[PDB]
Structure to design on (597 residues):
RNA sequence: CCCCACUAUGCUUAGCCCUAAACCUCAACAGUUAAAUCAACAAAACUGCUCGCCAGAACACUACGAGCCACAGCUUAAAACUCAAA
């Protein structure tokens, strides 16, 4: 027929879906260094997904891992471990 | 099933720690567990003070016992660890490596919800 | 170096000092700021009481106790007593969100005590005991 | 209650009171200016009037 | 049971106690502790708590959408290019 | 042998561009209001850019500028709206002049 | 209503009681957005099939009868007198 007519196909310019920083990586309650990245330095509160930036699945995994570590003696509850205060800041929140 | 016993033992000298680990692994074997590995996480100050057997512990030695035990042995092992005096705190979990991580394509965006209210003029 | 809002950690080597004293040795000023009162107790790092002052102990009574003015007066009195006992720098630990939460601190500064750190210790249960029923107003 | 001894503190209190009154007046002026906020509510209402929401079809 | 002078602690910089207290209050507010204490003064019944949470979530949605629209349209606050027509 | 509309669209430079995000285009200023420059870059909608501090006087009507397009049209659907709210202008970053 | 103190009670175990604005007052299943869209408001209008329910207000979550571990109870549930409204 007419060669210049459009053709049905998938979007070639579609950018790959953005992946959470923890996508594809195992979250373990023993990895207190990683879990401490998602808790408040001063109050120990677990940050929300709007702060962490994680997906729902990884947010739930982080939450359950933090609770397990706190109850099993791996992680403090009321504050962030001082040994992990200088770890990379992966949470979108500034207090000062 | 495959379980991982996370164990916090009282900070003791090497002979006492070795004896306690041997006793715990022997108890696991007696209850039927096949111990696969014993991993030492080192001795560290506890995140918070723990009062176990009328004694306040500030430091503890962290170990992991990966094993395969019948479902009925978990309760008995929990009771045994509760009765033990050298164990600050022992918790048996299902082995994290058992649960395979499903592949994630990426964060699928959520479009703004539509047609929640009738388009009649207000 | 750069100033850090995080306190120095016990067991770590820190160059910060106050009159030659480490952060673990600075006395502690506990300010319980209730909704109707403000109590300030100065204690040593080894937990030795040194001074005490509340809005009640300053001659304020009834609703007048739960004011910033009464808390400031209590802070001045407590700071004066602590300075009499040899206290210069203090770590402030405040619990409660009463009217005297901040003004009492000011009183200490007016009394002559330098605040090196401020800590909130307001008791926040993780859903423990059940508080009283809501008022109808 | 002898003012002669207390002159310095009395003057400090008076200066603070005058500063508070002048600062209240300046705060009213600033609110009229609207610099602190991203925009005044009136100008924002004008902007939203220019681009109204359309919860209906036409 | 935890260590002390680690949680909710802010170091004062050159005796600037005002700024230190402001930072501490900002930290408590952002973490939501202040609102939690205020709501825990008197018991909030579960139905009342659910109603408050629903109202606050709807308020958050509306406020975020309004802020997004305001930011989107703010570029159009510039001068009138076709004045007189 | 008359060219069809599909042929024209297929070979049009705008179609050849693909997505407009982070594409360098050449715009022409056609209107100036104080420090606002209204630049037409061949798209459906013009962009509005602030006059740069450097070489501000060098921007006049008919000037050719290098823009980095971010969107051909600024539209967004908001809470409760039935149609996308459009400001009827593009989004581009004014880099400078093209000689 | 406000403040203080305390009890039944809230908790555990073993039985009962079987009621809620038990409401998302919007039944289950399958399907449509075509139009003739559509009283009003609410959370758009519908179609096929089936079950349950409804038939002016009040009397009436009542009386009597019956059933229930319930004995100041719960379920089912009227009628007479009255009004031109609800
Ligand atoms: S982004 Fe892949 S699991 Fe969250
Ligand atoms: Mg009472
Ligand atoms: Mg209980
Ligand atoms: Mg209900
Ligand atoms: Mg009833
Ligand atoms: Mg009855
Ligand atoms: Mg009967």
């Amino acid at each position: 027929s007419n060669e210049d007519l459009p053709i049905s196909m998938e979007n070639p310019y579609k950018e790959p879906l953005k992946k959470c920083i923890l996508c594809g990586k195992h979250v373990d309650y023993k990895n207190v260094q990683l879990l401490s990245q998602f808790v408040s330095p001063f109050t120990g509160c677990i940050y929300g997904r709007h702060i962490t930036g994680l997906c729902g699945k990884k947010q739930k995994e982080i939450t359950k891992a933090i609770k397990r570590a706190q109850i099993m003696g791996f992680m403090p509850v009321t504050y962030k471990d001082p040994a992990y205060l200088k770890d990379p800041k992966v949470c979108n929140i500034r207090y000062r | 099933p495959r379980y991982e016993l996370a164990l916090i033992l009282k900070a003791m000298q090497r002979p006492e720690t070795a004896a306690t680990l041997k006793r715990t692994i022997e108890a696991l074997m007696d209850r039927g567990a096949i111990v696969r590995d014993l991993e030492n996480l080192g001795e560290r100050a506890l995140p918070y003070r723990i009062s176990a057997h009328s004694q306040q512990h500030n430091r503890g030695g962290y170990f992991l016992v990966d094993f395969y035990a019948p479902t009925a042995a978990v309760e008995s092992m929990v009771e045994h660890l509760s009765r033990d005096i050298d164990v600050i705190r022992g918790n048996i979990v299902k082995h994290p490596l058992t649960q395979e991580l499903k592949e994630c394509e990426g964060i699928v965006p959520v479009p703004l919800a539509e047609k929640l209210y009738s388009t009649k003029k207000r | 170096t750069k100033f850090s809002i995080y306190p120095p950690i016990p067991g770590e080597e820190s160059s910060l000092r106050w009159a030659g004293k480490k952060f673990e040795e600075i006395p502690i000023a506990h300010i319980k700021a209730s909704h109707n009162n403000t109590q300030i107790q100065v204690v040593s790092a080894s937990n030795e009481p040194l001074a005490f002052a509340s809005c009640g102990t300053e001659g304020f009574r009834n609703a007048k106790k739960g004011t910033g003015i009464a808390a400031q007066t209590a802070g001045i009195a407590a700071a004066a007593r602590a300075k009499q006992k040899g206290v210069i720098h203090i770590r402030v630990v405040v619990k409660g969100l009463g009217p005297g939460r901040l003004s009492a601190m000011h009183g200490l500064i007016m009394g002559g005590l330098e605040v090196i750190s401020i800590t909130d210790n307001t008791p926040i249960p993780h859903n423990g005991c059940r508080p009283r029923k809501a008022r109808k107003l | 209650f002898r003012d002669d001894a207390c002159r310095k503190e009395i003057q400090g209190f008076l200066d603070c009171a005058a500063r508070a009154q002048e600062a209240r007046k300046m705060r009213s002026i600033q609110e009229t200016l609207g610099e602190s906020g991203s925009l005044l509510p009136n100008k924002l209402n004008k902007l939203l009037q220019r681009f109204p929401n359309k919860p209906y079809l036409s | 049971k935890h260590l002390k002078f680690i949680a909710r602690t802010v170091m004062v910089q050159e005796g600037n106690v005002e700024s230190a207290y402001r930072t501490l209050n900002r930290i408590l507010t952002m973490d939501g502790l202040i609102e939690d204490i205020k709501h825990r003064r008197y018991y909030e019944k579960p139905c009342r708590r659910r109603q408050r949470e629903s109202y606050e979530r709807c308020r958050r949605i509306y406020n975020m959408e309004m802020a997004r629209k305001i930011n989107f349209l703010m570029r159009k606050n510039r001068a009138d290019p076709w004045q007189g027509c | 042998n008359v060219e069809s509309f599909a042929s024209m669209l297929r070979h049009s430079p705008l179609t050849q561009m693909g997505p407009a995000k982070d594409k360098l285009v050449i715009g022409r200023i056609f209107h100036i209001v104080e420090n606002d420059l209204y630049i037409d870059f061949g798209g459906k909608f013009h962009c509005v850019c602030r006059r740069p501090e450097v070489d501000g006087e060098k921007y006049q009507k008919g000037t050719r500028v290098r823009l980095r397009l971010l969107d051909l049209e600024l539209t967004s659907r908001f809470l409760g709206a039935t149609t996308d709210t459009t400001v009827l202008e593009a989004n581009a970053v004014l880099l400078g002049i093209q000689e």
Q: What stands out?
A: The CA atoms of residues 5 and 11 of chain D lie 12 Å apart. The interface with chain E takes residues 38-39, 43-44, 47-48, 50-51 of chain D (CB under 8 Å). The helical segments of chain D are 3-33, 41-50. The radius of gyration of chain D is 23 Å.
